């Protein structure tokens, strides 16, 4: 009946853990300990984008590594020209509680959402000179927590109602629904091939989803608190996790277990955003201590520190070419960082 | 050059509109409606003048925004920081649910977690103890001891209502830096908007002195 189902569930969990331990011979630290250290990393603020009048929650870069889109609590979406600091667009929003924003790979659409539980897509290329809303994705019973663009017609939306969905643009219907989490999913990261994505939720677990069949591939655990940040390795065989505690974790898709732990005693605050470099060697993570830390992804050593914000760093990411890093924060400022 | 101007001029026009929007928003008052289980929330909404509901009403030339997040149905700790810096929080408690895991105890539990919140260290709290007409009839047949085992007073409405207010007012641990306003309202009460306007006046006074450095 109902009693033996739980018993076989624990047996299956034990077998999975035993399989994970069986395929664990040497950790990443032992293998990498022979290579040369990355050294100290120095980065300087090249551009300071001002104009937002509230806390900034979204940062997502553009595919051309020049155009930036940011969201804040004033109900305005501003498209930034990072090279010239000029504001390309200023999109007013019906609801000022937007938490995430997305930039389409083609650069023609921008999507945002928040406590309204609606993912609104805004057209940037129209005959008229204004930016108009194109679609309003409704059907989620929780706050919008992440949105990523696969192409001009498919968008994956993470919401606070514990479920993730894949939407269609020209028809406002949910193509597939992703279920299996027990807490609110706060972030999602797409693979380079646009075939899989990983979502981190508040149950200290991360799930790998397949877009086409709409079901969970693997489940990753190891964190102690809610997961707020996620980023996908350029390989596609790994991803990094940032939780509400002071620990960053790197997971392997093929090994299906924890690989390397990024933590320090002086850090007590949580992680809001996590991003990787072009080669996947530097792990950049924002923290609640008004500071950004650069981690050596292979040795867990703190390579450098980005201290240029007077408030919590909420959003962070790296350009497609990896030349510049743009950091957003609650102080209503955007900062672009480059090496000497 | 002859092409930097065109992009810069368009950019400069945006901050002109951004500054105007910010100035208009800075003159507005934001209110957080934070009742539990529809504890007379709809009654006070109509008495002033979907994930989150926005309500706008004008009183004494002051613009008010009320945000209702009762339909969110999610973990509060993941989005309650978005309301940091709000002018005040409006709390609605029905006095008639003391005879309904108890409905009253749930109200105090969420009140305690919200009043003693890191993002709401010094925010004003307006407590609305509504449904007082039904409370008077219920207290004449059902004692208050069903909800509060430690109650020692009689079943008179005046002291029973005061006892509930004292327990709610005793849940805050920062009485030296924040104040809770309690007002008993009913369906026919017409002074609710005046009470809210009076409560936010000191908040404006609070911010005015901070601007000139007195606080």
């Amino acid at each position: 009946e109902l009693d033996q189902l739980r018993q076989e569930a624990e047996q299956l969990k034990n077998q999975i853990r035993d399989a994970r331990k069986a395929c664990a011979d040497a950790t990443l630290s032992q293998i990498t300990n022979n290579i040369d250290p990355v050294g100290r990393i120095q980065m300087r603020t090249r551009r300071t984008l001002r104009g937002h009048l509230a806390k900034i929650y979204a940062m997502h870069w553009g595919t051309d590594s020049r155009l930036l889109v940011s969201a804040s609590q004033d109900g305005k979406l501003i498209i930034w020209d990072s090279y010239t600091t000029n504001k390309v667009h200023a999109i007013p929003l019906r609801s000022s509680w937007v938490m995430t924003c997305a930039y389409a790979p083609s650069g023609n659409y921008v999507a945002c959402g928040g406590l309204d539980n609606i993912c609104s897509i805004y057209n940037l290329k129209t005959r008229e000179g204004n930016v108009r809303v194109s679609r309003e994705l409704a059907g989620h019973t929780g706050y919008l927590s992440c949105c990523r663009f696969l192409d001009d017609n498919q968008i994956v939306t993470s919401s606070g109602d514990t479920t993730c969905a894949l939407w269609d643009i020209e028809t406002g219907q949910q193509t597939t629904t992703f279920t299996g989490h027990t807490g609110d999913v706060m972030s999602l990261s797409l693979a380079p091939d646009t075939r899989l994505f990983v979502s981190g939720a508040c149950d200290a677990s991360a799930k790998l989803w397949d877009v086409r069949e709409g079901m969970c591939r693997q489940t990753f655990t190891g964190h102690e608190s809610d997961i707020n940040a996620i980023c996908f390795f350029p390989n596609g065989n790994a991803f990094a996790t940032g939780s509400d505690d002071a620990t960053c974790r790197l997971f392997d898709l093929r090994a299906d277990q924890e690989l390397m732990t990024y933590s320090h005693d002086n850090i007590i605050c949580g992680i809001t955003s996590v991003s990787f470099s072009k080669s996947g060697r530097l792990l950049l993570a924002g923290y609640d201590d008004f500071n950004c830390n650069v981690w050596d992804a292979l040795k867990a050593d703190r390579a450098g520190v980005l201290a240029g914000h007077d408030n919590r760093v909420s959003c962070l990411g790296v350009t497609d070419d990896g030349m510049a890093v743009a950091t957003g924060s609650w102080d209503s400022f955007l900062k672009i960082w480059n090496g000497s | 050059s002859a092409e930097d101007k065109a992009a810069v001029e368009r950019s400069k026009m945006i901050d002109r509109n951004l500054r105007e929007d910010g100035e208009k928003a800075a003159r507005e008052v934001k209110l957080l409606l934070l009742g539990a289980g529809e504890s007379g929330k709809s009654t006070i909404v109509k008495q002033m003048k979907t994930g989150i509901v926005e309500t706008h009403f004008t009183f004494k030339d002051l613009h008010f925004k009320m945000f209702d997040v009762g339909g969110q149905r999610s973990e509060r700790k993941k989005w309650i920081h978005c309301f940091e810096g709000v002018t005040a929080i409006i709390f609605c408690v029905a006095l008639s649910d003391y005879d309904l895991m108890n409905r009253m105890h749930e109200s105090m539990k969420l009140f305690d977690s919200i009043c003693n919140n890191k993002w709401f260290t010094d925010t004003s709290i307006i407590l609305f103890l509504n449904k007082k007409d039904l409370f008077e009839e219920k207290i004449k047949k059902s004692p208050l001891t069903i909800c509060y085992p430690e109650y020692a007073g009689s079943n008179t409405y005046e002291e029973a209502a005061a006892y509930i207010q004292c327990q709610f007012e005793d849940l805050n641990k920062r009485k030296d830096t924040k104040e809770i306003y309690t007002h008993f309202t009913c369906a026919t009460d017409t002074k609710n908007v005046q009470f809210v306007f009076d409560a936010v006046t000191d908040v404006i006074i609070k911010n005015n002195l901070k601007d000139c450095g007195l606080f």
């Epitope: 390309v88 000179g129 | 050059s1 092409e3 065109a6 368009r10």
Partner: single-chain antibody, 235 residues
Framework: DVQLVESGGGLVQPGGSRKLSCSAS????????MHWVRQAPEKGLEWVAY????????YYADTVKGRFTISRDDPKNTLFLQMTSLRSEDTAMYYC??????????????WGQGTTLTVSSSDIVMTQATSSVPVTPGESVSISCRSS???????????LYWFLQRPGQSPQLLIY???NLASGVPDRFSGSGSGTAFTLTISRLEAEDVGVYYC?????????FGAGTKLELKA
């Protein structure tokens, strides 16, 4: 449906005054800058005046400075061009062209129908190829362009624009910044160049490609149009 209707033209005595009204409908006129371009009878295009989106920046051609003034009415979506001391050389077809910061440039995508004005009585030089070339459908055409000054800028943008004026129709933008295809233009057209020499190539010819092709630089203001190359079908 973007529309720009021009009205207020007719016979004018020399030394008189007139005003041109360009009504805008179907687009955000407030955020669009406006240009005035006239075409003399059996001649080429020439820029007259430009007004910014916020009216802060206003420029005039050297041949119309002082006599001509330009104004816009954003609430009524109407563009004005007041004229004083009209000469016999001002007889042309005036076009109001919308222009906004688009795709990292300032395109001239939409042109008005035009109005008839009859008056009875340092600049970059763009040199065009032979004014007439005989072509037949199915072939590939190559139109050249030469600039006195290098249109390549320090930011990597070469500000060269290509237009097609069909017989009896207003000019239409084809190529902006020498490399980008405008919206609604077939992929047959292509643009290439380096510094001062530019080439526009049509891969597959069609009967709808008949017209005069114009090149204008947006490097300095002071926008100058080429003589124009006319494409005619062989008999």
């Amino acid at each position: 449906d973007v529309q720009l209707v021009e009205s207020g033209g007719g016979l004018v005595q020399p030394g008189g005054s007139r005003k041109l009204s360009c009504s805008a409908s179907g687009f955000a006129f407030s955020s669009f800058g406006m240009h005035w371009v006239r075409q003399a009878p059996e001649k080429g295009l020439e820029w007259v005046a430009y007004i910014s989106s916020g009216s802060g920046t206003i420029y005039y051609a050297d041949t119309v400075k002082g006599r001509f003034t330009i104004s816009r009415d954003d609430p009524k979506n109407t563009l004005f061009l007041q004229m004083t001391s009209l000469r016999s050389e001002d007889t042309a077809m005036y076009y109001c062209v919308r222009s906004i910061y688009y795709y990292g440039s300032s395109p001239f995508d939409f042109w008005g129908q035009g109005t008839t004005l009859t008056v009875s009585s340092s600049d970059i030089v763009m040199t065009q190829a032979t004014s007439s070339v005989p072509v037949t459908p199915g072939e590939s055409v190559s139109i050249s362009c030469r600039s006195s000054k290098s249109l390549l800028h320090s930011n990597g943008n070469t500000y060269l624009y290509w237009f097609l004026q069909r017989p009896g129709q207003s000019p239409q933008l084809l190529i902006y910044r020498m490399s980008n295809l405008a919206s609604g233009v077939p992929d047959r057209f292509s643009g290439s160049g380096s510094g001062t020499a530019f080439t526009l190539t049509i891969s597959r010819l069609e009967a709808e490609d008949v017209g005069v092709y114009y090149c204008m630089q947006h490097l300095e203001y002071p926008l100058t149009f080429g003589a124009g190359t006319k494409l005619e079908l062989k008999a």
